[PDB]
């Protein structure tokens, strides 16, 4: 017999990114339900070492590799630097991690990430880790535009800047999602869609210095499409999201 | 007698902002030492409800107003959303806070902030809170460019984007500081200074899509000055920083 030989198939990694509280962990659970309901084998990787309660069962869990509170004590750091270094420490255990990855056998692998967006936008950590965990496989990032933050036009545009910094750093395609869309009224959603798909957002800014205006002009001039509206609680928009994942990975 | 009548003088609020671990809390302590060594009356406000150990004695402390861990339990949130909501909860106690502010009597008030930069760049929380705590007084924000992150040109430019989003949202002038400069060699510092003061950074980018290039061009075209090099551990650059604070507040 040969016990090194395992059944092989395609694996697709889906990294769910977003600001604090934008709904990443809930969406991972909802997207896993959706994919399994459609007979698509799906596993979950939790990369947040600080989370306490999860609505899903992670197949790989960062909390078994690094103790955040032990880090904050052993290095005398602040609450946020401690979470950054903890994620950084994951890469020191690349040996143990690659073994867990090897023994993982799933067609779709959902990666829940911490709601510290500087790890993906302002540091190399997000790129190095995401490339390490998805090595040898196609990947896509899903970035969550929090609906609560997006209904304000100036706040919406800052999130497009943030998402662009992530896309530039991470080495994979990115899908934009408008998360928690149930928090919006019909008129708010339509107004936001017109802001983007028609460029009218530039008028909702009013008093803006010349510098910020030039950034905004560049953003709006390169807005390809409106973020996919998703509501994990209402379990809506997951088919659009999964249709775009398939279009991107193909 | 009239016991409502207190001695009045000018107060200047200095908000120290920056990415996780950029050195905010250490710089606050160093800047307080510097100002007191020069016979300048200085108090400290700690706005980070999650910090465990501080090198200074805060005159107002957010931890006495909100319990972060109690928030994460009572609302079933993640580790980062819990810290955002905790800061948000501070404004619910505006009554108690304004009383502490009133009873504060200091010429310079240093405000240590949490290393969750979305509170200042991607949410209104930072603006509302900073305006509330400094009401009736001149204020300045000090944003920390972490030297470790700034030595990579693409990482430096993303931090200029981030600092611009903060400056646009916060309603006060902002001073840029290159923190932890002791981590850099002489050649690295000079190279970074040439990147900015001469615009040569645009060549250190190499393979860049057209969209990211247009953002970078706008950033570099509006780089007024190089961030002030500060090293709290070497206690250097604090006089330059304090000379610029005075120039801005005047
Ligand atoms: N080399 C060097 N290290 C510094 C300097 N200032 C702070 N540090 C170190 O960098 C780490 C972060 O310092 P700290 O003041 O807590 O930064 P913070 O930005 O408040 N962290 P947080 O975002 O978690 O609140 C600590 O190890 C501190 O000793 C500096 O000027 N040089
Ligand atoms: N209305 C609404 N609330 C949602 C939705 N998805 C999540 N939430 C709620 O929003 C809060 C944040 O959800 P959570 O999945 O933990 O988000 P997270 O982005 O992983 N948080 P963190 O950044 O701290 O890890 C929770 O109260 C969750 O119930 C949604 O689609 N609609
Ligand atoms: Cl890092
Ligand atoms: Cl908010
Ligand atoms: Mg989460
Ligand atoms: Mg701190």
Residue numbers in the entry:
A (entry chain A), B (entry chain A): -9 to 240
From the paper:
In the archaeon Sulfolobus acidocaldarius, the GTPase Saci1281 (from hereon: SaGPN) represents the solitary GPN-loop GTPase. Structural analysis of the GTP- and GDP-bound states of the Sulfolobus acidocaldarius GPN enzyme (SaGPN) showed that this central GPN-loop GTPase adopts two distinct quaternary structures. The dimer interface emerges alongside the surface of helices α3, α5, α8, and α11, whereby α8 contributes substantially to the dimeric assembly due to its central position allowing the formation of a hydrophobic pocket.
In the GTP-bound form, the γ-phosphate induces a closed dimeric arrangement by interacting with the GPN region that is relaxed upon hydrolysis to GDP. The eponymous GPN motif (residues G68-N70) is found at the base of α3 (residues N70-L81), which is involved in activation of the inline attacking water molecule (N70) and nucleotide coordination at the substrate pocket of the second protomer. Notably, the water that is suitably positioned for inline attack has still a distance of 3.4 Å from the γ-phosphate of the GppNHp substrate mimic. Accordingly, additional conformational changes for the GPN motif may be feasible during hydrolysis of GTP itself. Additionally, the Walker A motif (GxxxxGK[T/S], x = any amino acid) takes part in nucleotide binding, whereas K14 is responsible for the coordination and orientation of the β/γ phosphates of the nucleotide; T15 is the only proteinaceous part of the octahedral Mg2+ coordination sphere. Mg2+ coordination is also supported by the Walker B motif (hhhhD/E, h = hydrophobic), which interacts indirectly with the Mg2+ ion over a water bridge to D102; the latter residue also forms a hydrogen bond with the hydroxyl moiety of T15. When deprotonated, D38 acts here as a general base for transient formation of the attacking hydroxide nucleophile like the corresponding residue in the G2 box of other SIMIBI GTPases. Overall, the GTP-bound state of GPN-loop GTPases with its closed GPN-lid corresponds to a ‘locked’ state.
